[PDB]
């Protein structure tokens, strides 16, 4: 009657922000073959028919920068070049002396290197020439691999793919994924129309810096997130509407020399480059990015007084992994000069831009510890065609502040890679028992 | 038309200085590029070096530190030195014009190519003999 | 080194090493007792006065030599033939390559 009574409710809409361990999602003709690092076989695959439900009249407050989506993904890929890389080929018989001379050719770059090595047996040597190029090697007094000194060095089996095919992130059961599906949000702060889904969207584990690849458009503007836009030390990541187009190339027909190292093991070496001697380029339309530039700056004076000035540097310095557009195209991991994408000076108010790219095959684990690969070299002239969807800028803290702001870019963590497509996801879990009084009570 | 004549000692002591002199008749010597081809009996044709205004003159990695070219743009003719000759210095020196060349293969920023010459209009050719 | 073609036929001529990189190859005819003529310059271009009998080897491929076809001999061809190799992977030849002398047959 007029006093209620305690009532038990199974299945209610409440959740609470909590942190669970996320599973995979990987379509299902991702018949690759082979075995990609990832997501072949190994993921469960993807619904068919996915199902999206619009969270009508709820607000939620998101966080990108401190949701627990990006820590696993960092960690899971992590883990994942570190199981794809335990069984195949460990090259320590490789750190000999190298007596290096110049490539056949008419700033010598590639080194032709010979020297001794073991053979299947445990006895005789053998003198066998390889083709390094000069970011791998380094002198001493000949030459020496420059992974020698730090680092234990593995070889990359050739059965394995470094291409990044989409990994949908899922909760299991009892939780559950928001997405914020508003055209214009810079990933922090209360969310006007949330949706809730099982699994994300299609997400390509693509590791670069500076320049962001292959990612999600922004909608309507140009999209602008920082964690402290007022902290110089903190990354600004950017996401375009329309994507810039890119195109790499290595004009290099290498050869693949494989040498038997012992029982099992085959270490492969580059062979005599078939053509001419041209380095590793990328292009970039003039037309394109002179108007994807005017559409971040516009986006900027948003933050920092309607009438500034806005100019555009290189890198300062540090790494070669960062001051240079670094990433993978078809095996070879590049390393681009952005020197003329960055030459830039905005005020208040016809072919292609071409970049000198170089090409490393020994490369260090992001962890600073001393674990290498060797990437074993690519025959033919690669080419690979792909989208740029954001940035990676940083702002040098000047101390005469709102005169004129300086953005340089850079990178080195690859949480900003994740950072960049789980913008728009958080981790919740559902709890189905909710009292509530009402005037109803049970039997004697 | 353009009619080239040579014209020298045809006759050096060994160990001296040759001096030949290219008659032009037909362009200017410095509206076109020149060079000197000499060739000994039975063997094959070997560049020596081309000579043009402005500077551009380069000489054979092998004949670098004896020959000297030159122009008279006053007289119209082309000049050539070779200091310290020997017996294999015995061939028939020829004097023709040079049309230069651009093979591009690479991406041309990159400095991806490589200026090659050819020579369409030759000389009559002077004989010159190495002897004491 | 001698090849002897039969007139009316096809010619076939190889001068200088196999090909490094993109090459420019400059062919030349020597009369017997005259001054050598430009042929074919870059890989296959001929300048004014040169019939279309006259086809070298592009310099686009990597690995052949340099190779000078003549079809529909004739007893005038009958002389020397040397040829000019720039590489890009080779430094500047100075001396051109041992040529090769056309035996009109018949």
């Known amino acids: 009657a007029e006093n209620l009574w305690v009532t038990v409710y199974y299945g209610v809409p409440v959740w609470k922000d909590a942190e669970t361990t996320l599973f995979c999602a990987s379509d299902a003709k991702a018949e690759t073959e082979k075995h990609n690092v990832w997501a072949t076989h190994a993921c469960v695959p993807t619904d068919p028919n996915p199902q999206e439900i619009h969270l009508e009249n709820v607000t939620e407050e998101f966080n990108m920068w401190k949701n627990n989506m990006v820590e696993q993904m960092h960690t899971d890929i992590i883990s994942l070049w570190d199981q794809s890389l335990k069984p195949c080929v460990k090259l320590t018989p490789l750190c000999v002396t190298l007596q290096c001379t110049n490539v056949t050719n008419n700033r010598g770059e590639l080194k032709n290197c010979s020297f001794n090595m073991t053979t299947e047996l445990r006895d005789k040597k053998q003198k066998v020439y390889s083709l390094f190029y000069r970011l791998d090697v380094v002198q001493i007094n000949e030459y020496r691999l420059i992974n020698c000194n730090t680092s234990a060095i593995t070889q990359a089996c050739p059965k394995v793919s470094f291409e990044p095919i989409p990994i949908h992130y899922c909760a299991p059961a009892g939780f559950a994924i928001l997405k914020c599906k508003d055209k214009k949000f810079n990933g922090t702060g209360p969310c006007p129309s949330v949706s809730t889904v099982q699994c994300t969207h299609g997400i390509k584990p693509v590791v670069s810096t500076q320049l962001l690849l292959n990612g999600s458009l922004a909608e309507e503007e140009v999209m602008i997130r920082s964690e402290n836009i007022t902290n110089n030390a903190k990354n600004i990541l950017v996401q375009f509407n329309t994507p810039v187009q890119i195109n790499c190339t290595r004009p290099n027909n290498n050869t693949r020399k494989s040498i038997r190292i012992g029982p099992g093991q085959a270490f492969y070496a580059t062979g005599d480059i078939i053509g001419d001697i041209r380095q590793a380029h990328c292009n970039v339309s003039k037309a394109t990015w002179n108007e994807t530039l005017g559409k971040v700056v516009k986006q900027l004076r948003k933050h920092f007084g309607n009438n500034t000035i806005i100019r555009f540097a290189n890198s300062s310095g540090g790494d070669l992994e960062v001051t240079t557009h670094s990433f993978n195209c078809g095996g070879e991991f590049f390393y681009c000069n952005t020197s003329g994408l960055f030459n830039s000076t905005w005020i208040s108010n016809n072919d292609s831009i071409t970049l000198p790219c170089r090409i490393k095959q020994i490369i260090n684990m992001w962890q600073r510890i001393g674990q290498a690969m060797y990437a074993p070299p690519i025959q033919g002239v690669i080419r690979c065609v792909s989208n740029i969807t954001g940035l990676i800028l940083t702002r040098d803290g000047g101390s005469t502040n709102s005169t004129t702001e300086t953005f340089r870019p850079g990178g080195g963590d690859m949480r900003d890679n994740w950072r960049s497509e789980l913008y728009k996801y958080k981790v919740v879990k559902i709890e189905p028992l909710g009292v509530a009084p009402t005037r109803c009570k049970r039997r004697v | 038309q353009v009619h080239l004549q040579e014209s020298g000692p045809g006759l050096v002591k060994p160990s001296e200085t040759l001096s030949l002199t290219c008659n032009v008749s037909?362009?200017?010597?410095?509206?076109?590029?020149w060079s000197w081809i000499r060739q000994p009996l039975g063997k094959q044709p070997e560049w020596i070096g081309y000579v043009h205004d402005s500077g551009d003159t380069n000489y054979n990695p092998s004949l670098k530190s004896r020959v000297h070219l030159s122009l008279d743009k006053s007289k119209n003719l082309v000049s050539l030195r070779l200091t310290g000759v020997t017996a294999a210095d015995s061939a028939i020196y020829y004097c023709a014009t040079t049309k230069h060349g651009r093979r591009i293969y690479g991406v041309v920023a990159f400095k991806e190519w490589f200026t090659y010459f050819y020579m369409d209009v030759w000389g009559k050719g002077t004989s010159v003999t190495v002897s004491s | 080194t001698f090849v002897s073609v039969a007139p009316g036929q096809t010619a076939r001529i190889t001068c200088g090493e196999e090909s490094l990189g993109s090459r420019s190859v400059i062919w030349y005819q020597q009369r017997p007792g005259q001054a050598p003529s430009l042929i074919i310059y870059?890989?296959?271009?001929?300048?004014s006065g040169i019939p279309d009998r006259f086809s070298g080897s592009p310099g686009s491929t990597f690995g052949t030599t340099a190779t000078l076809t003549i079809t529909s001999v004739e007893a005038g061809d009958e002389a020397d033939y040397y040829c000019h190799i720039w590489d890009s992977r080779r430094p500047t030849n100075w001396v051109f390559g041992e040529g090769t002398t056309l035996i009109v047959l018949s």
């Open positions: 037909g362009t200017l010597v410095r509206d076109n590029y």
């Open positions: 870059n890989n296959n271009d001929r300048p």
